[PDB]
Amino acid sequence: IFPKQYPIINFTTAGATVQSYTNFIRAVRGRLTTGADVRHEIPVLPNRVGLPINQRFILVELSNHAELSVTLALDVTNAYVVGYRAGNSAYFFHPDNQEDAEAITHLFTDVQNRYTFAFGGNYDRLEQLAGNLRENIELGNGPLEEAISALYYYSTGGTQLPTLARSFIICIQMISEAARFQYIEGEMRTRIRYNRRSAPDPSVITLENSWGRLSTAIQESNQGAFASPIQLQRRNGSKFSVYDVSILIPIIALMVYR
Ligand SMILES: Cc1ccccc1-c1ccc(C(=O)O)s1
């Protein structure tokens, strides 16, 4: 079996810096936005429809101080993690539809063991499996180091499901959500700068929750003006309304097709 070859971007927590993390997220954004183009200075990710299988995925190869390596597969249509490989096993989130189920059969096709979880990659179920909300799961280089080891050792049963789910929540936010939002990239750069370890505040969590709604609102807008306002949160958890794309141009880096 000679598998389909997808673009690969490398990141290591070993000696990570603001620069190396910045280079990584910019490279991930680069390979996500080669298809489709810009609306209000914000790139729209390729549409699911008509996209050849050979262009459907990018791979993120993560290494850590323990010199363990896992490869995450990201769907170029939404920047989100669909599955990963560690050694001779690949693990996939439960696909949402028959089309996505067929598409992921093209990933890691030479791997000896394929596993598909009963749960999807959505935070609601991952938080239940982890035994914590995103607001109580620390992010930073330390959590990412640990998450890489946890994903690696699941291949041999060394990792318990709650720790695997916690580890997915860490990787998704520090990779997918950072690619999607300059604001969240900024949050992760700040943690790395100050060698910090801290849970995302409500501003980050509400942006993650609102990515789909913001993508639709911006693309359906009358030259930037929303048909309905969108409620986001400040760092202190208070709600404000957004009526227009302007304030979001520095915040949101990528949108899903509307
Ligand atoms: C989330 C968001 C979007 C657009 C513009 C601003 C903001 C804020 C994040 C945090 C904020 C505080 O703590 O005031 S305001």
Tab-separated table of C-alpha atoms and ligand atoms in Angstrom:
chain	number	residue	atom	x	y	z
A	1	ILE	CA	0.000	0.000	0.000
A	2	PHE	CA	1.546	3.353	-1.168
A	3	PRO	CA	-0.632	6.028	0.518
A	4	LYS	CA	-1.706	9.427	-0.865
A	5	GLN	CA	0.903	12.058	0.097
A	6	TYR	CA	-0.344	15.216	1.863
A	7	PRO	CA	1.607	18.370	2.751
A	8	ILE	CA	3.353	18.063	6.166
A	9	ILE	CA	4.201	20.897	8.622
A	10	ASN	CA	6.569	20.074	11.544
A	11	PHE	CA	6.437	21.534	15.073
A	12	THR	CA	8.469	20.478	18.129
A	13	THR	CA	7.924	21.529	21.775
A	14	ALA	CA	11.696	20.834	22.215
A	15	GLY	CA	13.251	24.326	22.358
A	16	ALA	CA	9.972	25.996	21.171
A	17	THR	CA	9.995	29.832	20.928
A	18	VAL	CA	7.514	32.596	19.971
A	19	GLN	CA	9.358	32.557	16.572
A	20	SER	CA	9.180	28.719	16.010
A	21	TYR	CA	5.479	28.666	17.068
A	22	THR	CA	4.721	31.713	14.846
A	23	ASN	CA	6.530	30.043	11.865
A	24	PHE	CA	4.443	26.862	12.479
A	25	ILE	CA	1.000	28.563	12.610
A	26	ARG	CA	1.836	30.772	9.561
A	27	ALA	CA	2.921	27.604	7.646
A	28	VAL	CA	-0.354	25.797	8.647
A	29	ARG	CA	-2.436	28.844	7.481
A	30	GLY	CA	-0.327	28.928	4.263
A	31	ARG	CA	-1.228	25.315	3.253
A	32	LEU	CA	-4.914	25.692	4.368
A	33	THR	CA	-5.601	28.824	2.175
A	34	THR	CA	-3.896	27.811	-1.175
A	35	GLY	CA	-7.504	26.946	-2.283
A	36	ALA	CA	-10.336	29.597	-2.226
A	37	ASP	CA	-9.584	33.330	-1.503
A	38	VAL	CA	-10.389	36.543	0.427
A	39	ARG	CA	-13.596	38.291	1.720
A	40	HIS	CA	-13.078	41.535	3.795
A	41	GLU	CA	-9.293	40.722	3.922
A	42	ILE	CA	-10.239	37.296	5.528
A	43	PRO	CA	-9.416	34.120	3.520
A	44	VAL	CA	-12.280	31.581	3.022
A	45	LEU	CA	-11.181	27.907	3.254
A	46	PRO	CA	-11.801	25.609	0.246
A	47	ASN	CA	-15.431	24.394	-0.173
A	48	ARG	CA	-16.083	20.656	0.614
A	49	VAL	CA	-17.713	20.366	-2.896
A	50	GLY	CA	-15.517	19.581	-5.977
A	51	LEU	CA	-12.273	19.468	-3.873
A	52	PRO	CA	-10.082	16.538	-5.083
A	53	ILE	CA	-9.263	13.944	-2.333
A	54	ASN	CA	-5.515	14.546	-3.116
A	55	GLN	CA	-5.942	18.200	-1.824
A	56	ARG	CA	-8.367	17.439	1.093
A	57	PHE	CA	-5.855	17.088	3.996
A	58	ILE	CA	-2.668	18.523	5.495
A	59	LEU	CA	-0.524	16.739	8.107
A	60	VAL	CA	0.967	18.240	11.269
A	61	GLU	CA	3.955	16.238	12.588
A	62	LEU	CA	4.431	16.975	16.335
A	63	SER	CA	7.612	16.006	18.246
A	64	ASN	CA	8.536	16.675	21.887
A	65	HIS	CA	11.513	16.527	24.338
A	66	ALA	CA	10.782	12.763	24.802
A	67	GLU	CA	11.567	12.475	21.009
A	68	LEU	CA	8.065	10.998	20.435
A	69	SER	CA	6.339	11.870	17.115
A	70	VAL	CA	2.599	11.867	16.235
A	71	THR	CA	1.035	13.059	12.973
A	72	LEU	CA	-2.309	14.920	13.089
A	73	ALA	CA	-4.460	15.089	9.936
A	74	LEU	CA	-6.335	18.421	9.407
A	75	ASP	CA	-9.289	18.843	6.996
A	76	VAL	CA	-8.365	21.860	4.756
A	77	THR	CA	-12.149	22.752	4.603
A	78	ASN	CA	-12.407	23.628	8.359
A	79	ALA	CA	-8.740	23.505	9.682
A	80	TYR	CA	-9.908	20.866	12.251
A	81	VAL	CA	-8.236	17.624	13.366
A	82	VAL	CA	-9.914	14.472	11.888
A	83	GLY	CA	-7.449	11.904	13.252
A	84	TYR	CA	-3.825	11.070	13.974
A	85	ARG	CA	-1.152	8.402	13.537
A	86	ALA	CA	1.236	7.114	16.261
A	87	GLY	CA	3.545	4.248	15.162
A	88	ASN	CA	1.552	1.384	13.582
A	89	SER	CA	-1.963	2.727	14.511
A	90	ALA	CA	-4.163	5.552	13.215
A	91	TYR	CA	-7.158	6.913	15.202
A	92	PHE	CA	-10.054	8.865	13.600
A	93	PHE	CA	-12.926	10.814	15.181
A	94	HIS	CA	-16.378	9.490	14.185
A	95	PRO	CA	-17.095	11.156	10.782
A	96	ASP	CA	-20.285	13.345	10.602
A	97	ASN	CA	-21.460	11.871	7.213
A	98	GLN	CA	-20.798	9.051	4.640
A	99	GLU	CA	-18.748	11.557	2.471
A	100	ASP	CA	-16.237	12.429	5.290
A	101	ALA	CA	-16.114	8.682	6.267
A	102	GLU	CA	-14.972	7.806	2.681
A	103	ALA	CA	-12.517	10.796	2.594
A	104	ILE	CA	-10.644	9.732	5.824
A	105	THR	CA	-10.105	6.159	4.371
A	106	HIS	CA	-7.441	7.947	2.172
A	107	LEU	CA	-5.396	8.995	5.283
A	108	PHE	CA	-2.534	6.875	6.718
A	109	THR	CA	-3.665	4.053	4.317
A	110	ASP	CA	-0.404	2.025	4.809
A	111	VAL	CA	-0.869	1.992	8.658
A	112	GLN	CA	-1.404	-1.579	10.009
A	113	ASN	CA	-4.277	-0.727	12.440
A	114	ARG	CA	-7.112	1.788	11.810
A	115	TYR	CA	-9.446	2.722	14.709
A	116	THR	CA	-12.502	5.008	14.490
A	117	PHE	CA	-13.865	6.353	17.801
A	118	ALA	CA	-17.653	6.432	18.469
A	119	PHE	CA	-17.273	10.162	19.420
A	120	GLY	CA	-16.624	13.087	17.053
A	121	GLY	CA	-13.944	15.778	17.475
A	122	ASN	CA	-16.474	18.292	18.974
A	123	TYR	CA	-15.442	19.874	22.326
A	124	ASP	CA	-18.789	18.985	24.030
A	125	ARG	CA	-18.038	15.208	24.042
A	126	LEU	CA	-14.191	15.573	24.355
A	127	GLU	CA	-14.722	17.644	27.580
A	128	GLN	CA	-17.053	14.904	28.986
A	129	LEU	CA	-14.383	12.224	28.171
A	130	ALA	CA	-11.583	14.428	29.639
A	131	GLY	CA	-13.561	15.147	32.841
A	132	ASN	CA	-13.013	18.922	32.393
A	133	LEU	CA	-14.265	21.914	30.383
A	134	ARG	CA	-11.782	23.815	28.152
A	135	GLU	CA	-11.819	26.576	30.855
A	136	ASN	CA	-10.096	24.081	33.273
A	137	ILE	CA	-7.530	22.541	30.767
A	138	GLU	CA	-4.173	24.400	30.718
A	139	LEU	CA	-2.564	25.318	27.365
A	140	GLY	CA	1.111	26.129	26.711
A	141	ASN	CA	4.309	24.338	25.631
A	142	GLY	CA	4.121	22.071	28.735
A	143	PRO	CA	0.550	20.852	28.084
A	144	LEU	CA	1.469	20.324	24.350
A	145	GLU	CA	4.636	18.295	25.316
A	146	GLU	CA	2.399	16.103	27.550
A	147	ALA	CA	-0.359	15.854	24.906
A	148	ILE	CA	2.151	14.556	22.296
A	149	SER	CA	3.354	11.851	24.736
A	150	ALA	CA	-0.288	10.942	25.608
A	151	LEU	CA	-1.296	10.613	21.869
A	152	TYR	CA	1.852	8.517	21.216
A	153	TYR	CA	1.258	6.052	24.083
A	154	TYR	CA	-2.439	5.496	23.240
A	155	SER	CA	-1.105	3.224	20.382
A	156	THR	CA	0.091	0.724	23.114
A	157	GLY	CA	-2.679	1.361	25.744
A	158	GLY	CA	-0.327	3.428	27.998
A	159	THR	CA	-2.772	6.419	27.855
A	160	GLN	CA	-6.266	6.340	29.533
A	161	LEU	CA	-9.187	7.762	27.439
A	162	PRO	CA	-9.671	10.849	29.705
A	163	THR	CA	-5.982	11.857	29.195
A	164	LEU	CA	-6.281	11.179	25.421
A	165	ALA	CA	-9.416	13.431	25.256
A	166	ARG	CA	-7.637	16.158	27.344
A	167	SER	CA	-4.671	15.851	24.917
A	168	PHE	CA	-6.951	16.269	21.837
A	169	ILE	CA	-8.461	19.428	23.414
A	170	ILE	CA	-4.916	20.821	23.891
A	171	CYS	CA	-3.736	19.986	20.316
A	172	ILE	CA	-6.971	21.233	18.618
A	173	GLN	CA	-6.776	24.628	20.381
A	174	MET	CA	-2.992	25.177	19.971
A	175	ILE	CA	-3.091	24.138	16.260
A	176	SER	CA	-6.595	24.355	14.647
A	177	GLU	CA	-7.980	27.293	16.729
A	178	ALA	CA	-4.606	29.179	16.513
A	179	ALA	CA	-4.633	28.770	12.666
A	180	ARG	CA	-8.297	30.006	12.607
A	181	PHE	CA	-7.745	33.104	14.868
A	182	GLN	CA	-4.804	35.577	15.111
A	183	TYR	CA	-6.323	36.288	18.594
A	184	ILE	CA	-5.822	32.632	19.704
A	185	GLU	CA	-2.393	32.443	17.981
A	186	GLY	CA	-1.575	35.555	20.097
A	187	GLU	CA	-2.786	33.799	23.316
A	188	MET	CA	-0.486	30.817	22.598
A	189	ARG	CA	2.510	33.078	21.634
A	190	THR	CA	2.015	34.921	25.009
A	191	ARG	CA	2.067	31.599	26.954
A	192	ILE	CA	5.279	30.507	25.135
A	193	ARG	CA	6.949	33.975	25.597
A	194	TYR	CA	6.410	33.897	29.410
A	195	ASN	CA	6.825	30.070	29.847
A	196	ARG	CA	3.224	30.036	31.177
A	197	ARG	CA	0.660	27.262	31.569
A	198	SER	CA	-2.980	28.476	31.749
A	199	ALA	CA	-6.524	27.618	30.628
A	200	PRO	CA	-8.154	29.699	27.866
A	201	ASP	CA	-10.294	32.593	29.170
A	202	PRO	CA	-13.951	33.088	28.078
A	203	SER	CA	-12.876	35.394	25.165
A	204	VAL	CA	-10.942	32.446	23.613
A	205	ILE	CA	-13.660	29.836	24.370
A	206	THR	CA	-16.478	32.000	22.883
A	207	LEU	CA	-14.385	32.719	19.717
A	208	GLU	CA	-13.837	28.925	19.283
A	209	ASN	CA	-17.620	28.300	19.822
A	210	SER	CA	-18.520	31.146	17.376
A	211	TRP	CA	-16.127	30.333	14.449
A	212	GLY	CA	-18.931	28.787	12.288
A	213	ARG	CA	-21.456	31.589	13.110
A	214	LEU	CA	-18.790	34.352	12.507
A	215	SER	CA	-17.803	32.696	9.139
A	216	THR	CA	-21.490	32.680	8.006
A	217	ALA	CA	-22.238	36.233	9.366
A	218	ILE	CA	-19.169	37.724	7.550
A	219	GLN	CA	-19.845	35.920	4.202
A	220	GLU	CA	-23.645	36.683	4.202
A	221	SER	CA	-22.990	40.352	5.262
A	222	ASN	CA	-24.115	43.381	3.181
A	223	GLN	CA	-20.551	44.720	2.459
A	224	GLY	CA	-19.498	43.835	6.060
A	225	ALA	CA	-22.865	44.653	7.797
A	226	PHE	CA	-24.423	41.606	9.603
A	227	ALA	CA	-28.184	40.785	9.162
A	228	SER	CA	-28.157	39.788	12.917
A	229	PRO	CA	-25.585	40.798	15.598
A	230	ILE	CA	-23.202	38.105	17.036
A	231	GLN	CA	-22.635	37.925	20.850
A	232	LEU	CA	-18.987	37.329	21.945
A	233	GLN	CA	-17.387	37.403	25.449
A	234	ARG	CA	-14.682	39.613	26.999
A	235	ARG	CA	-11.879	38.061	29.150
A	236	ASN	CA	-14.089	38.780	32.249
A	237	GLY	CA	-17.002	36.756	30.687
A	238	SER	CA	-19.282	39.801	29.977
A	239	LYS	CA	-21.123	39.664	26.580
A	240	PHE	CA	-20.944	42.300	23.784
A	241	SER	CA	-22.585	42.356	20.306
A	242	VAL	CA	-20.698	42.559	16.943
A	243	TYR	CA	-22.679	44.182	14.044
A	244	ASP	CA	-19.874	44.530	11.436
A	245	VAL	CA	-16.756	42.670	10.087
A	246	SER	CA	-14.359	45.626	10.846
A	247	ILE	CA	-13.508	44.760	14.533
A	248	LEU	CA	-13.039	41.047	13.524
A	249	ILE	CA	-10.398	41.554	10.713
A	250	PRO	CA	-7.480	41.411	13.260
A	251	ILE	CA	-9.204	38.542	15.229
A	252	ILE	CA	-10.241	35.855	12.626
A	253	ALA	CA	-7.602	34.537	10.138
A	254	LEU	CA	-9.643	31.822	8.235
A	255	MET	CA	-13.387	31.161	7.574
A	256	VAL	CA	-15.328	27.972	6.650
A	257	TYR	CA	-17.388	28.246	3.407
A	258	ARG	CA	-20.984	29.568	3.973
B	1	LIG	C1	-13.283	38.707	21.193
B	1	LIG	C2	-13.158	39.921	20.632
B	1	LIG	C3	-13.520	40.154	19.279
B	1	LIG	C4	-13.441	41.238	18.696
B	1	LIG	C5	-12.968	42.350	19.343
B	1	LIG	C6	-12.655	42.180	20.534
B	1	LIG	C7	-12.632	41.112	21.443
B	1	LIG	C8	-12.246	40.961	22.783
B	1	LIG	C9	-11.524	39.919	23.399
B	1	LIG	C10	-11.469	40.356	24.742
B	1	LIG	C11	-11.926	41.408	25.250
B	1	LIG	C12	-12.023	42.336	27.010
B	1	LIG	O1	-11.528	41.517	27.719
B	1	LIG	O2	-12.524	43.375	26.720
B	1	LIG	S1	-12.672	42.268	23.995
